[PDB]
Each structure stands twice: as structure tokens, then as C-alpha cells.
Amino acid sequence: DNIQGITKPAIRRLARRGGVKRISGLIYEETRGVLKVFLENVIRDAVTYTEHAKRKTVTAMDVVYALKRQGRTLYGFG
Amino acid sequence: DNIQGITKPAIRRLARRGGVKRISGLIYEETRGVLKVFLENVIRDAVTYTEHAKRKTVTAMDVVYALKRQGRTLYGFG
Amino acid sequence: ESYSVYVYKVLKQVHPDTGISSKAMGIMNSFVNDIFERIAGEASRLAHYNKRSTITSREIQTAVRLLLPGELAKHAVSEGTKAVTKYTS
Amino acid sequence: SRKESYSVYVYKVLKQVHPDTGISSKAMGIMNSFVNDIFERIAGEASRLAHYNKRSTITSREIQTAVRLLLPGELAKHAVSEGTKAVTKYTS
Amino acid sequence: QRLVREIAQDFKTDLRFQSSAVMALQEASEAYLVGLFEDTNLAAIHAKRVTIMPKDIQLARRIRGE
Amino acid sequence: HRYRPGTVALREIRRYQKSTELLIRKLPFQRLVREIAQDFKTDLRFQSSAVMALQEASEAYLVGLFEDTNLAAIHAKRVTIMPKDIQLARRIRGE
Amino acid sequence: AEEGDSESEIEDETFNPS
Amino acid sequence: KTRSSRAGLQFPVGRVHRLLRKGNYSERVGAGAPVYLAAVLEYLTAEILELAGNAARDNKKTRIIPRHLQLAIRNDEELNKLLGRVTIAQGGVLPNIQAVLLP
Amino acid sequence: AKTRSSRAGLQFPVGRVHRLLRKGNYSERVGAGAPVYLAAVLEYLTAEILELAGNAARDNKKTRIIPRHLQLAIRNDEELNKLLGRVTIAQGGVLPNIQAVLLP
DNA sequence: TGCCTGGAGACTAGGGAGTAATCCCCTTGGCGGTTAAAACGCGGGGGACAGCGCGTACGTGCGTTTAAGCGGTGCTA
DNA sequence: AGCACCGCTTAAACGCACGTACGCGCTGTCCCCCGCGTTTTAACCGCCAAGGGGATTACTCCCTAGTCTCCAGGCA
């Protein structure tokens, strides 16, 4: 149970960067599930690329390709 | 002004297909501008493909290619 | 030239006493062409990342597993594996 | 192993428009990713345009059509102008 | 058809059209408007109303990315 | 001396829209990531830049979702964000 | 015992293999 | 005999192999690849036609129409995910009314 | 022995772009003006984004360019925001924006 | 049904990929120390939600008007 | 095949009348989230060490492109 390691002040700081002034008490269980669906899609694609590349190690280019497949296009990691 | 040819009961009929029960009085003037912007974009790309292909008639495959460029795949006119 | 007679051959095996219109035949033609282009483009992308010069049943299988959903991709991999097993034996 | 890059070329571009300005490695990597992404977009659109008209050669007309479809507004006008100015000077 | 020809005179004078090329435009335009009203009705229900406002259309086009 | 509720909230909005650092810690996110990954292939090993890219993409996704959540909450003539605003944003977004 | 208007089907004919 | 008779399929193999070399994908297509891709296309075609035939029998008809294709695709969990950005001509929408509008 | 970049008057290379066109499975043949045109377009886009990045670096009283300056330079221009509307920049942050109803 | 154009059957050469060896870089595991950050109460002011009243804007219905379809013909880009 | 014209019909658009359901504004209450203070915990830095797998090179088999001949599958 490591999705409880995404604490309440961290979600509150992400909401303060998002512009939110006042926060209810039920946002956190929704945000953890949304984060654990987005992770469970990107790591699924990254482990598929790794399992095709005949590799023991998930690199960063697999993650960049997994994000490019979904339309995210992250810059800064090659 | 052929934008007034898109009449009020046509927009009301599109809203009845969309599931709208009660309609205000400015939705028609909003919808005309939205449709105008969308059609200007698609006609601009279709005329670009037509001028590239050295033709003078605008075929339907140019429209299908422009809709694929916007990201809206259309089955039936191929 | 199209896939129309092959769509008729597939349709007469799952539903014998039925027909199909020409508009639905064109929609099925567009569907077959779209899925062909998607799988071929993804298999072309997979062969460049590993610096290989080809495309192979492993490449097509990796392009199937990335593109199709969970219950559909398993049956697609099973049908393709059975068909490529029957080709050599 | 020796690997391709664009860092010296981005530095040569940067030392013309701003004669006293540095750049960090993270920003240089972002610029390399930007150049690679725009290259892939224009080359893919040109290779898609080359197949619709049943041609085999990608030329500057297909590259110009791929630029005109992909860049919005006056940026496409200035890109076509710069490219036509550079192709005109090359032949002479 | 008159609207499409009028807005297509702004890009190239003396063009010519087919019939399926206008039929595909009409299909795409009707599907786009139906999807826009399907999201806009959800916006108006979330605003605790029944009548549909232009602010709902602008919210749908803002959240969708248009 | 105490601040009236909202002043410290706007102060945090101003300082976290000014800063550029990461907000989620690294070891809980890494333990979350290593636990999710093993359900796709056996014996997974990680570089540092893969998790460093996952954290950037995850926080960018969450900020881009809370912006539309705030827009839905303002459209509902409220200030407090609610889970139904997140559901409306993910329904209109196409997820 | 009851049937719909055939015009519904007439607007989209069956694909002809020839 | 043809390779579609060897593999036991119904879609052709030589046309798929010709479209793989011809469409500039790699300096080389492999082999088992057109057979594998023809099996995948035949399975997907048979699934679409099975659900379309069920949707056509549900309305007392003997000819599959684009409305039947629309209902077959949109009334399935995974085909709607595969074909979410696709507009079918003469297809229409799904009949649904929100529960806050009915009296 | 002059190069083609000196003959075209550009700063980006031409032979590397020609090699990447010939070794990337785009077509069978490659014309002799296409890498010159594409290098001109890439050089123009590079100078266009570096001008705004240098303006942001002068505005924030700095010497070097950082990903925050690149983020401000892209998101403060409308055409670059439309061209790069699906791009996430690492260590770039967001824009300062507070709605007018949240503050008194 | 005509037939013809694309698909099958052998054979060969050359380079592409599969196997084995070995380096050494980088990933994983562990122990301690500091302190910043997370966790837990607590009082209170502010906002979400419910109830009520009112005026108007948008619905349904009927008679008149208008131009969208529906054919037929011809010329030419 | 696309555009231009022509005659006819009739179904859809427009305009006006009227009534009532709903959007908006006001008020009251009470729950609940926020600022603040104190205590507990594990994140982060620093250092160390074992060893597993990425990466490169060399050799060799075998797989597919190319060419020639033959002949039937499918499209009008």
C-alpha cells in the first residue's frame, strides 16, 4: 500500500500550483485513483517496449516513447 | 450573408438530436460562429491539398485527408 | 480493387442467411484499411528503435499488443499464432 | 561512442541574435528535442504527401506543402519566405 | 452548399466541387455539432439548470481544448 | 496576530506558481512505481531518468487536471472543488 | 403483421461485387 | 495452391505482402508477417460482422446497415475504445435521456 | 572545397539532413533542394524561439537561458503555444494566473 | 463469361541476424545522523445548501409566405 | 460529370398571440475546512561494496531479394 505515500500536503501543493483556493476533504481518494490509472497505463506501455527490446532494465527512452504513444511529448530526457 | 441560411429550427433540431430539452436565444448566434470557424479550417486544408495536387476540382478524398489531419476519421467516403 | 468479396466470404460463415449494403461494405473497407495502416505504421516504428531492417511476426505481434485492448489482443495473438503455426507445419 | 547532436549549431544561432547570452545543458537538450520533433513532423508529412500523388521523389515543393499545412498563421509565411530565399541563393 | 462555396471563395477564386466532397463536410459538421451539444448539455446539468447558455458552450470548448 | 482564511492560501498559490521544483517526494513515488511495474513483466530494473520522467509527467497531468477542476468549480458558482468537478472534467476531456 | 417504410433501406444499397 | 489455403485463412496473403513492400515501411518485410496480419484482420472483421448481424437480427431485418454498424460498435466496451475518434456516415447516435429531464 | 551550408548561406548543416532523409524510410528518392529548404525552416524556428528566450532572460535579470525562460517564451507567444500545445517541458513550471473571483 | 494481369514454383548469392566472450558501468542493498516535514488536536468564521418570492423569456399553436426539392435539357471545362 | 437554366408542387420557415414554469435574487442555518501549535517520523545526505547486465566484437549460418517461367482468380 504505497499509494498512501502520496500524502495530503503534496496533493494540496499540487492544487495550490493549479490555482485552487479552497479544497474539500474527498479530492484525495479520487486523485490517487486517477494517478494510479495513469501510472498503470504508462508503465504497461514501458514494460511492453522493454519486453520487446530483450532488456532487463527499463530505460528512459521507453518512457518517452510510452508518453509519445499517448500524446504527451515530454522534452528533456532525449 | 449565407450564414443566415442555417436556420433556427435546424439548430434546434440538432440540439434535439443532442439531447437538449430547452434552448435559450443566443445559442444560434454562437453555433453559427463555431460552425464557421470549423468549416474555414477544414476548407483551408482541403484547398491546400487541392492546390498541391495541381487540380481544379476539389474531390472528396481531400476532405477525408483534411478531416484525418484534424483528427476526425470519417468512414464511408473512401 | 478492394476487400469486398472477402468481406462476403467472412460474412457467410458467421451469419448464413443475411445480406449487407454497399454503404456498409464501404465502411468495412475503410475499417480494414485503417487497421492495416495503424498496425503497419506501429510495426514500422518498432523496427527503427532497435536498428533492425525488417519486419517480422514478432514485430507485428508487438504492434498488436500495444494497439488493441486487453481481451481483444489476447484472442488476436492466439489467432495469429495459430495461423503462423499452420503455415509451416 | 560518437553521437550526433545540434548543440554547436544552436550555439552559432544563439550568438547571432544575442551576442551576450549563455545557455545551459537542460535548455540545450530541450532545443535538441524541439529540432528533432519538428524534423520528424515535417518529414512525416512530406512522406505522406509523396504517396498520395503516386510520386517517388520528395522535393522542395512537397517540403513547402508540408510546412504550409503544419505551421499556423504568419509563421508559415515567414518560413516559406526564408526557405525560398535560401533555395534561390543555392542555385546561383 | 452556398455557405461552403462562399467561404471557399476566400482561398482560391474559380474553384469547382463534387457532391461527395460536400456530403462529407455536412456529415462531419453535423457530427461535430451533435458532440458539442452532448457535452454542453452535461455542462448545463452540472450548473443545476435546464436551459442551455452560451457560457456552457464556451466552457465545453475551453475544457475540450478548442 | 492570525491571518484571515484565504490570505495564506493566496500566498501559497503565488509562491507555488512562482517556484519550479517538484512537489511529490521521491522515495514514496519510487516505491509506488516499482510496485505497479512488476504486474506487466518479471524482474524489472530501473534507471533514475525513467522515474524522473514519470514524476514530471504525473505532476504535469495532475496540474492540468486541477486547472479544469477549478474551472468547473467556478462555473458551478462555488469556490470549493468537489469530486464531481473532477468527474465532469474527465467526462468532457474524453477519458 | 406490421412493417416499416422500405425507403429507409433504399437510400443505402448493398455492395455489388461486380 | 495459395498461401491462404495453407494458413487456413480467408483474407489474401499476397496482397498484404505487396502492400507491405510497396508502402515504404522498412527496407524489408519479414514473412510470417502477412499471414499474422491477415489472421488479425480476419478476426476483427468477423467480430464486427458478428455484432452487426446480431444488431440486424434484433430489429427484424436481413441486411446490415450503417445504423446497425453504429449500434454494434457503440454498444461494445472495447470496440468503442478502439474506434473512439471515428465518425461513421449515416450512423446516428445512441438513444439516451438524462434522468434530471424526465418528469 | 566549399560545403553546401556555405553555398546556401545557412548555419544548420545540409549533409546531415540529407543523410537523415535518405536513411529514414520516407521515400526512394530525395531532391537536391529539400534539405536546404528544411534547414532554412529549422534555422528560422530556432532563431525565433531563441529571441523570445533571450528576451525572457533579459527580463528576469539573468545571463543564461533556463527551462523556465523557455516555458515563458513559448507560453507567452500565441503561435508557439498553438504549435506546441501538447508538449510538456521538464523543469519549466506553469504561468502565474489567478482568477478574478478568488481574490477580493 | 473473357481474359489478363498478378500470384505461385525453383534456384542462387550475399549480407543480415543469431551465439558466444568479456569488460566494466551502473543498479541494488545497507548503516548512521540530522532535521524538515508529516501527523494530530482545536477553536471559529465563512460558505454550501435549503426555502421562498417574483417577473419574464421561452414553450406551443395557427395562418401566411417562401424557397427547397424534383424532373428535364444543354454545353463545356 | 459539373454548372446553368426552367417550370411546378408543397413542405418547411416566419410571425404573432399567450400562458406558465423556471432563473435569479434574498435570507437563514449550521457544518466543515483553515490557521496555528506541538509531537513524532522517516527523507535526505554521505559513504561503502557486491555483482548483474548493457555493450561491444568476432564468427558463421540461413533467409529473403532478384530473376525466369507458368498459369489461374477475380473484375467488369
- What's the resolution in A? 6.7
Chain breaks in chain B (C to N over 2.5 A) after: none
All cell numbers assigned to B57: 476540382
C-alpha separations of C51 from C48, D6, H26, I1 in Å: 5, 21, 11, 33
Residues of D whose CB is below 8 A from B65: 52
Do D70 and B45 meet the contact criterion of CB atoms below 8 Å apart?
no
Q: Taking the domains of chain C in order of start, what are their residue ranges?
A: 1-89
Task: Establish whether the CB of H2 is closer than 7 Å to any nucleic acid atom in strand J.
Answer: yes
Q: Which residues contact H74 (CB under 8 A, 6 or more apart)?
A: H80, H94
CA–CA gap between residue D59 and residue I35 (Å, rounded): 9
Query: Reduced to 3 states, what is the DSSP secondary structure of residue F42?
Result: coil
CA–CA gap between residue I100 and residue E23 (Å, rounded): 45
| Gyration radius (Cα) of chain B, Å | 16
What is the DSSP annotation of chain A? --GGGS-HHHHHHHHHHTT-SEE-SSHHHHHHHHHHHHHHHHHHHHHHHHHHTT-SEE-HHHHHHHHHHHT--EES--
DSSP alpha helices (H): ranges in B1-78?
Answer: 8-17, 27-52, 60-70
Residues of H whose CB is below 8 A from C64: 40
Phi, psi of D17 (to 5 degrees): -100, -20
Closest CA to I39 of I26, I55, I20, I67: I20
CATH 3.40.50.2300 fits D1-92, yes or no: no
Asked if B14 lies within 8 A of E4 by C-beta distance, the reply is no
DSSP annotation of I76 reads: T
Topology of the domain comprising A1-78:
Histone, subunit A (1.10.20)
b vs e for A3-22, b when ≥16 Cβ sit within 10 Å of the residue's Cβ? Answer: bebbeeebbbbbbbbbbbbe
**Residue ranges of E strands in chain E:** 16-17, 51-52
CA–CA gap between residue D54 and residue H24 (Å, rounded): 12
Do E22 and E4 meet the contact criterion of CB atoms below 8 Å apart?
yes
What is the DSSP annotation of F50-73? HHHHHHHHHHHHHHHHHHHHHHHH
Chain C segment 20-49 residues within 8 A of A by beta carbon are: 46, 49
CA dihedral B47, B48, B51, B57 (to 10 degrees): -20
All cell numbers assigned to H94: 445512441
Burial degree of I2 (CB within 10 A; 0-12, 13-18, 19+): exposed
Q: Please, which positions of strand J sit below 7 A from a protein CB?
A: 6-9, 16-17, 26-28, 37-39, 44-49, 57-59, 68, 77
Q: Which CATH number fits the domain C1-89, given the four candidates 3.40.1010.20, 1.10.20.10, 1.10.10.10, 3.40.50.1820?
A: 1.10.20.10
The total number of residues shown for chain B amounts to 78
CA–CA gap between residue F30 and residue F48 (Å, rounded): 10
DSSP annotation of B5 reads: G
Cα angle at B17 between B13 and B19, to 5 degrees? 115
Query: Reduced to 3 states, what is the DSSP secondary structure of residue C7?
Result: helix
DSSP annotation of B3 reads: G
C-alpha separations of A67 from A64, F54, F58, I86 in Å: 5, 9, 11, 11
Which of F11, F17, F58 to probe the I interface (max I CBs under 10 A)? F17
Residue type, G15: F
Indicate which technique resolved this structure: cryo-EM
**Over chain H, what HEC string results?**
CCHHHHHCCCCCCHHHHHHHHHCCCCCCCCCHHHHHHHHHHHHHHHHHHHHHHHHHHCCCCCEECHHHHHHHHHCCCCHHHHCCCEEECCCCCCCCCCCCCCC
Closest CA to D62 of I43, B58, I37, B45: I37
CA–CA gap between residue C20 and residue C11 (Å, rounded): 9
CA distance H76 to chain G (A): 24
Give the β-pairing of B57-58 and H63-64. unpaired
What is the DSSP annotation of I37-65? HHHHHHHHHHHHHHHHHHHHHHHTT-SEE
DSSP alpha helices (H): ranges in I1-104?
Answer: 4-8, 15-22, 34-59, 67-75, 78-83
Q: Which residue of I has its CA nearest to H25?
A: I25
Asked if H89 lies within 8 A of B74 by C-beta distance, the reply is yes
Closest CA to I91 of I66, I73, I62: I66
